[PDB]
Every structure is written in structure tokens, then in C-alpha cells.
Enzyme design. Sequence first.
Site, PDB file in Angstrom:
ATOM      1  N   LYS A 184       5.778   5.630  -2.879  1.00 21.47           N
ATOM      2  CA  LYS A 184       4.846   4.519  -2.999  1.00 21.47           C
ATOM      3  C   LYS A 184       4.176   4.325  -1.651  1.00 21.47           C
ATOM      4  O   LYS A 184       4.821   3.954  -0.672  1.00 21.47           O
ATOM      5  CB  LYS A 184       5.553   3.214  -3.398  1.00 21.47           C
ATOM      6  CG  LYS A 184       4.560   2.065  -3.585  1.00 21.47           C
ATOM      7  CD  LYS A 184       3.617   2.409  -4.745  1.00 21.47           C
ATOM      8  CE  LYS A 184       2.451   1.440  -4.902  1.00 21.47           C
ATOM      9  NZ  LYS A 184       1.218   1.897  -4.192  1.00 21.47           N
ATOM     10  N   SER A 185       2.880   4.582  -1.595  1.00 22.75           N
ATOM     11  CA  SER A 185       2.139   4.432  -0.357  1.00 22.75           C
ATOM     12  C   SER A 185       1.536   3.030  -0.260  1.00 22.75           C
ATOM     13  O   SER A 185       1.577   2.260  -1.218  1.00 22.75           O
ATOM     14  CB  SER A 185       1.021   5.465  -0.313  1.00 22.75           C
ATOM     15  OG  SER A 185       0.174   5.294  -1.436  1.00 22.75           O
ATOM     16  N   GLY A 186       0.983   2.702   0.905  1.00 23.50           N
ATOM     17  CA  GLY A 186       0.348   1.408   1.087  1.00 23.50           C
ATOM     18  C   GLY A 186      -0.714   1.490   2.165  1.00 23.50           C
ATOM     19  O   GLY A 186      -0.555   2.227   3.139  1.00 23.50           O
ATOM     20  N   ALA A 187      -1.801   0.748   1.987  1.00 25.47           N
ATOM     21  CA  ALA A 187      -2.899   0.729   2.955  1.00 25.47           C
ATOM     22  C   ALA A 187      -3.354  -0.713   3.130  1.00 25.47           C
ATOM     23  O   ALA A 187      -3.435  -1.460   2.151  1.00 25.47           O
ATOM     24  CB  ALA A 187      -4.071   1.576   2.444  1.00 25.47           C
ATOM     25  N   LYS A 210       5.006  -3.302  -4.307  1.00 23.15           N
ATOM     26  CA  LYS A 210       4.914  -3.180  -5.759  1.00 23.15           C
ATOM     27  C   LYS A 210       6.118  -2.520  -6.408  1.00 23.15           C
ATOM     28  O   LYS A 210       6.414  -2.787  -7.571  1.00 23.15           O
ATOM     29  CB  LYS A 210       3.609  -2.478  -6.120  1.00 23.15           C
ATOM     30  CG  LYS A 210       2.418  -3.315  -5.657  1.00 23.15           C
ATOM     31  CD  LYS A 210       1.118  -2.526  -5.591  1.00 23.15           C
ATOM     32  CE  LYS A 210      -0.029  -3.414  -5.113  1.00 23.15           C
ATOM     33  NZ  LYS A 210      -1.290  -2.647  -4.912  1.00 23.15           N
ATOM     34  N   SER A 217      -1.794   1.827  -7.179  1.00 23.36           N
ATOM     35  CA  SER A 217      -1.974   0.686  -6.282  1.00 23.36           C
ATOM     36  C   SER A 217      -2.999  -0.314  -6.840  1.00 23.36           C
ATOM     37  O   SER A 217      -3.846  -0.822  -6.112  1.00 23.36           O
ATOM     38  CB  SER A 217      -2.435   1.159  -4.890  1.00 23.36           C
ATOM     39  OG  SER A 217      -1.341   1.610  -4.100  1.00 23.36           O
ATOM     40  N   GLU A 244      -2.440 -10.434  -3.916  1.00 26.89           N
ATOM     41  CA  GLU A 244      -3.445  -9.437  -3.561  1.00 26.89           C
ATOM     42  C   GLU A 244      -4.789 -10.157  -3.587  1.00 26.89           C
ATOM     43  O   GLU A 244      -5.001 -11.021  -4.430  1.00 26.89           O
ATOM     44  CB  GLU A 244      -3.438  -8.294  -4.582  1.00 26.89           C
ATOM     45  CG  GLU A 244      -2.154  -7.492  -4.567  1.00 26.89           C
ATOM     46  CD  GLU A 244      -2.090  -6.577  -3.381  1.00 26.89           C
ATOM     47  OE1 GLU A 244      -1.132  -5.781  -3.293  1.00 26.89           O
ATOM     48  OE2 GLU A 244      -3.010  -6.656  -2.535  1.00 26.89           O
ATOM     49  N   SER A 285       0.823  -2.305  -0.355  1.00 29.81           N
ATOM     50  CA  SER A 285       1.256  -2.016  -1.723  1.00 29.81           C
ATOM     51  C   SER A 285       2.703  -1.500  -1.895  1.00 29.81           C
ATOM     52  O   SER A 285       3.181  -1.392  -3.024  1.00 29.81           O
ATOM     53  CB  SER A 285       0.293  -1.027  -2.390  1.00 29.81           C
ATOM     54  OG  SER A 285      -0.998  -1.579  -2.532  1.00 29.81           O
TER      55      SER A 285
END
EC number: 3.5.2.6
Lengths: 262, 273
Positions: A208-211, A47, A104, A140, A44
Site C-alpha cells: 500500500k503506497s501513499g503520496a 487505508k 488510493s 481525505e 493513503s
Amino acid sequence: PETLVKVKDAEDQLGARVGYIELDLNSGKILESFRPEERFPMMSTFKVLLCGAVLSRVDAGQEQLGRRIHYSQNDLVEYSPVTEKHLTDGMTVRELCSAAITMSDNTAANLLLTTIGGPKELTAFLHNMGDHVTRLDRWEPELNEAIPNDERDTTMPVAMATTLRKLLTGELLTLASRQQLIDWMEADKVAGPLLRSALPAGWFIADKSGAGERGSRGIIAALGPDGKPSRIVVIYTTGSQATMDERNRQIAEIGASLIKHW
Amino acid sequence: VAATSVVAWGGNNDWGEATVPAEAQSGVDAIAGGYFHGLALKGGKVLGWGANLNGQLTMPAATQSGVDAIAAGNYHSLALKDGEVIAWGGNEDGQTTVPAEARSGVDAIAAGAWASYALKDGKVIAWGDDSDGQTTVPAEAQSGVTALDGGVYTALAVKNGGVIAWGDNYFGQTTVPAEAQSGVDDVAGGIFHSLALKDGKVIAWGDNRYKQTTVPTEALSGVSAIASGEWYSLALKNGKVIAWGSSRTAPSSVQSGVSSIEAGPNAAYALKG
Ligand SMILES: [Ca+2]
Ligand SMILES: [Ca+2]
Ligand SMILES: [Ca+2]
Ligand SMILES: [Ca+2]
Ligand SMILES: [Ca+2]
């Protein structure tokens, strides 16, 4: 160089690769790095680049932040908490960006991707901005697959950090757009166990995190003390078998190192 | 049955909803998975973890003891205490405003993404969002119902072994198969698919683009329990969890010794007895 020690220790603890880059927001000088030019799935974190492209269009007058988009059941994919609630009333471009960045929301990102023409177009946006490394190939949720050695949907810590800096401080976006982008990042809701957990009071952070699958985890951020950002930090990791909490914890500890030696 | 440990997995655990804190790791007989939070029932007391942006974790005093069941939706929480339904958290769509008839005599509850359901004397009572018709109870579900469950845009009930389903039907998730008109013991609603447990056999219908209705062979008999997340499902068989849909699988930790399961929108939970 104690943060470098911690980063390498994170690889030791997680049994995986960790990429790190810490940039001075002003000069745009590299202050510290590890595997800066190796590739990692963005998840993510892309984004923020997507909304950067959206704002660029708003600035050029080809898009409106208030334009309302109606979608159908057919557009929904997993991890879409906000968009799944607006099947009837739809959502504005501004709301879609807020949801994609702060929650997210996968569907929101897919809807916004459509407004610019698809993943190839975001990649085109990055190229014309001077980033010939970062690439988005899928939508996605597929883009989070993180299959080893696959370069689709990836970036390098130095590339992502540079591009983030250009978007937040350059002349690429108007002052109003630069501020809206950083406002969305500051309103991030799904990154508390990361850099934010090592942050003492009065500090400013917009992130902004992402997994993803196969242990992929990451975060991009603009942070600083006294309510003002002064450095860009990018951290990506992939391949670990550890729990999400264990991975969050390692990133948090890298954050503590950054803060204690700031 | 009081669990001795709890295993949670699936999703990105973005809100901390899949991290069961130490206090809920043992002695809990029930767990309810919300989108951003989790609830647990321990010795009649409601425990919780995760995000509390909408106050879904600000426990009402009355839930500190004597609670019999719990449920969780996207922004709210539900508890059943001596026939009374207690609600708290987000209420933008009226999902926490408990109607008078649900203040006593209730024997079961279920939460939908933005709705709440109570079962009392065979009658299903619903409240909250109805933009997809999920809270307009069919006449048939207003008597003789023995089980109920809430989905994202839907709700299901069991009456005389037959499934009653309502709300969104874009993918046929509300078109009940001939096979589920009798003998059904439980139901579970996903976002675009639905489940029924019939004498140990899992029956699924609705969307299949992410394999939600592609029931593993092992789950076609001897299943004692089912549960559904938004895009994945769970079945419990002889203490072993079975998962399918959206590439979800069951780690080795839940391959044995599980006494009950719970499926949140994204995170799965197994209570090991
Ligand atoms: Ca190493
Ligand atoms: Ca009681
Ligand atoms: Ca209503
Ligand atoms: Ca019953
Ligand atoms: Ca349910």
C-alpha cells in the site's frame, strides 16, 4: 547492513527524512531500522488499517462486505477514480475497500470512515489493538497536508509495521478476513515504481503506497520470494523537494538493496 | 508549434501519467491527459505513457502516422485522422464504438471521463456513458458549434460565441452565466465547475468549495488559452501559465515560454515552444 547504507543515502539524495523498518513476518523480530520511532504522515497507507477495522466489524457481524452504499456528488473529493464512476449504482463495502487500497481512492476511504464513525474511531480501533502511536485525525484530502512537525495523521515505522503484522497474521481478524486484506494489498495498482520495480520474478508482494504534499511519500508491504510473504517493510519520507519520480526511484533502490542482500 | 521541452506537474503521479518520456519531450505539438495515461502527437504519430490496464496505450496501427488531434478520457484514447475519429482502450460504456457519422468530416474531438465527442459541420456527436446525460446532445448543439469539450459528467460547446452546457448540474456547473452568451472563444469542463474564455477573460462557474471558480485577477484579461482538470484550472497568458483551484499553482518552469497547455484530471502539462 547495506540496506541501512542505501536508506541513509536516500536521505542524502532527497535532502529529506526517511524512516525505515524491516520486520520478520514470523517472529515479528526487527531485522533492520532507521528513525523507527519518528513520526511521518501515513497518507493513503492508513487505508489498509481502515479496511482492517472494516473487516473486524464484518467478522463480528456488524457489517457486510456485500452491503451496497449509495452516495452523492457531495461526497466526492479529488483522486477518486473509482468512486466518481459509481454515483448512480453506488458501491459495496468490499468494492470500496478494493478501491481505497488498490487505487488510493480518497472518496472510498471517506465513505468507509463514515461506516465506522469517523477518524477518531479508527484511532480507537488502533488503541484497542495495542497501537497507541498511530493516529488518524482528518478525512481525505486534508489528512495528506504533511505540515512539518504536525503529528496529526501520522505513525512511526515501528508502530505501523507492528500493527500491519498484527492485522495480517494475528488472531485479530479471521483467517478469511486476513486473506481478503492481504489480497487487496497484493492487487495494489499504484505502487509499480516502488518496491515492485526491484522485484525479480516469482516474488510475492502485498503493499500500500501513499503520496502527500510537501514531498511526503511512503509504502507499507509484506513480501517474500517463492510466492510467499516473509517480511514486513515500512518506508516513509517527508520534506523533500524532489520530483515524485526521484522519490519513487530512491524507494525502489532501497528495495533493490533489500532484495540483493535478502 | 513543436515544443522543445515539456513540463508536467500536479497530482501524485500515481500511474506515471505525469512523467513525459524522453521521446515526447521534444517535437510534440499536442498532449492529451487521461486519468491513468498521457498521449502525445509527434509528426502525426501518437505516443503514450502511463498505465495500460484497459489498453488505452495499445496504439492502433492507424495512429502511427497522419494523426491531426488527440484526446483522452479515464480508460480510453481518441485520435482524429483526416476527418476520421479513431478510438481505443476501455469500452465498458461504448466510448470507443465510433458511430458512422464520426468516421469522416470531423474537425475536432474531445473526451469526457467515459464519453467521446466529435464536431463535424457545426454538429456535436456524442457517444459512450450517458448516466448523467453527458452524451445526449441538446438540439442547440447540433448545428453551428465551433468548439467543444468534455468533462467528467458534462460536456460544453460554443455556438455563435455562446456556451451550451449539459450533463450533471449538482453544483450549477451547467448553468451558463449571462456573460458567456456571446463573445466566448473556448470552454473547458471540470468535474463540478466550468470555464469559458471570452476575449481574453476567463469566466468560471459551478462549485467553489475548492476555489475552482475563484479566478486570479491576472486571468481576467489577455488570456489566450484555458484548460480544466477535475478540481483545478489553467490559463495561459503571454507564455505564462496561471493555475488555481485545490491549492494548485504553477511552478517557475512554466512562468514563461509556454506555447500551449493541457490539463488532465490531475496532472497539468505545458508545452514550451
Ligand atoms: Ca541523514
Ligand atoms: Ca493528417
Ligand atoms: Ca450510450
Ligand atoms: Ca473550431
Ligand atoms: Ca476537457
